[PDB]
Amino acid sequence: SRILLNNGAKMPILGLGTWKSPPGQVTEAVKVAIDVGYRHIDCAHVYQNENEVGVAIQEKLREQVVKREELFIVSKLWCTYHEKGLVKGACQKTLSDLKLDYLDLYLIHWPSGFKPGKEFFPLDESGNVVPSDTNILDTWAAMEELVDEGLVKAIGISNFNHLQVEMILNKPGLKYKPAVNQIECHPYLTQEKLIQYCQSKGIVVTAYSPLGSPDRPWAKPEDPSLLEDPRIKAIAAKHNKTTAQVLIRFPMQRNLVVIPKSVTPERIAENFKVFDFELSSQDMTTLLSYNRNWRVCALLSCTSHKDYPFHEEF
Ligand SMILES: NC(=O)c1ccc[n+]([C@@H]2O[C@H](COP(=O)([O-])OP(=O)(O)OC[C@H]3O[C@@H](n4cnc5c(N)ncnc54)[C@H](OP(=O)(O)O)[C@@H]3O)[C@@H](O)[C@H]2O)c1
Numbered sequence: 488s489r490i491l492l493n494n495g496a497k498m499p500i501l502g503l504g505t506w507k508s509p510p511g512q513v514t515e516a517v518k519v520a521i522d523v524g525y526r527h528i529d530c531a532h533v534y535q536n537e538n539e540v541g542v543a544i545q546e547k548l549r550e551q552v553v554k555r556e557e558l559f560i561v562s563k564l565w566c567t568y569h570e571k572g573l574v575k576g577a578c579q580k581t582l583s584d585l586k587l588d589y590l591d592l593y594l595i596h597w598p599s600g601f602k603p604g605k606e607f608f609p610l611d612e613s614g615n616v617v618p619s620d621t622n623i624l625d626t627w628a629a630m631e632e633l634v635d636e637g638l639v640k641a642i643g644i645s646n647f648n649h650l651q652v653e654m655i656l657n658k659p660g661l662k663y664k665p666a667v668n669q670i671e672c673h674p675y676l677t678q679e680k681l682i683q684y685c686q687s688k689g690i691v692v693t694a695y696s697p698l699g700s701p702d703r704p705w706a707k708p709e710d711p712s713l714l715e716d717p718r719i720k721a722i723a724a725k726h727n728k729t730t731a732q733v734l735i736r737f738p739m740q741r742n743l744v745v746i747p748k749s750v751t752p753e754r755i756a757e758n759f760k761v762f763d764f765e766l767s768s769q770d771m772t773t774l775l776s777y778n779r780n781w782r783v784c785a786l787l788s789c790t791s792h793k794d795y796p797f798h799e800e801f
């Protein structure tokens with residue numbers, strides 16, 4: 488149920504995602520999740536719902552359902568706060584919203600810094616994202632300070648390519664190695680090279696968008712649909728499981744952490760019922776065979792940013 492991180496802490500391999508969970512629904516989602524056994528919640532300031540996630544956690548702590556030490560709460564430093572001077576306040580805002588005194592894991596959400604200011608996606612008049620003059624290593628050093636001050640127990644990265652990870656690993660005077668790299672991963676984007684890289688370096692990989700993010704706001708009707716893939720439905724039927732259950736179990740059997748999102752109580756419970764069956768070797772081979780290098784998350788307006796991660800092969 489949990490994987491050991493480099494700081495000695497254990498991270499639950501199944502967590503609840505919260506991107507696109509409206510504040511109207513995420514409090515109930517998190518309450519239900521905790522009731523049915525989730526102990527890991529994946530959050531971010533940019534998801535605009537951390538206050539409501541926080542309400543749910545506070546309530547369940549107060550109800551004596553769970554103790555804080557049993558929860559594993561992750562959040563992420565948004566791109567507009569990469570300047571060394573902005574990092575601590577960004578973390579403290581997340582902590583205040585979540586009503587917590589520490590995070591279990593805090594990630595650099597994307598390797599790119601954006602122009603500081605109120606807008607999460609500052610654009611120029613021609614639609615290009617406006618970068619900031621920040622660099623990965625200075626942002627990393629700021630993240631390390633959060634560990635040293637007790638705000639966070641572990642730090643990591645998200646959407647970093649292997650060269651960007653290597654930059655941090657090779658930093659003279661590195662204080663903390665990244666514990667986790669959180670990346671998009673599912674049968675249409677199987678990430679074999681980056682997973683082998685990270686796992687060889689002692690970095691745990693978390694798979695995001697494991698169901699293919701059908702609710703992503705830029706979906707096009709001609710896009711591939713993992714949950715509707717008849718090939719994956721057939722593997723699910725053979726196990727008397729749903730397609731979502733197969734898609735969640737798949738990364739678990741690759742020694743990945745996985746964070747499916749739902750706000751629908753029946754699905755939150757369904758998605759956790761993945762510890763009672765095993766995909767066969769042939770199932771795993773078949774699912775890996777569906778790779779198409781297809782990404783849910785890769786914003787066009789960011790493709791000229793100097794730190795855009797997806798020009799590299801991996
Ligand atoms: N680090 C990053 O850059 C990054 C990027 C993307 C995602 N993430 C994290 O990863 C999480 C998961 O990714 P995601 O939100 O993109 O998408 P996802 O988990 O792949 O898919 C969520 C979508 O699937 C639906 N769904 C959930 N369970 C289902 C089930 N059993 N049957 C049918 N449909 C089901 C949900 O609907 P309902 O909610 O309406 O039930 C929602 O529309 C995020 O929420 C976020 O926490 C991180």
Ligand SMILES: O=C(O)Cc1nn(Cc2nc3cc(C(F)(F)F)ccc3s2)c(=O)c2ccccc12
Nearest residue numbers: 506533597598599784785786789792794795796
């Ligand atoms: O962020 C999430 O969790 C999900 C996520 N993904 N995307 C796609 C992105 N593509 C990027 C590319 C870069 C780049 F590094 F390439 F510059 C930087 C930042 C991004 S956001 C979004 O546009 C988005 C908008 C609101 C809330 C969350 C998201």
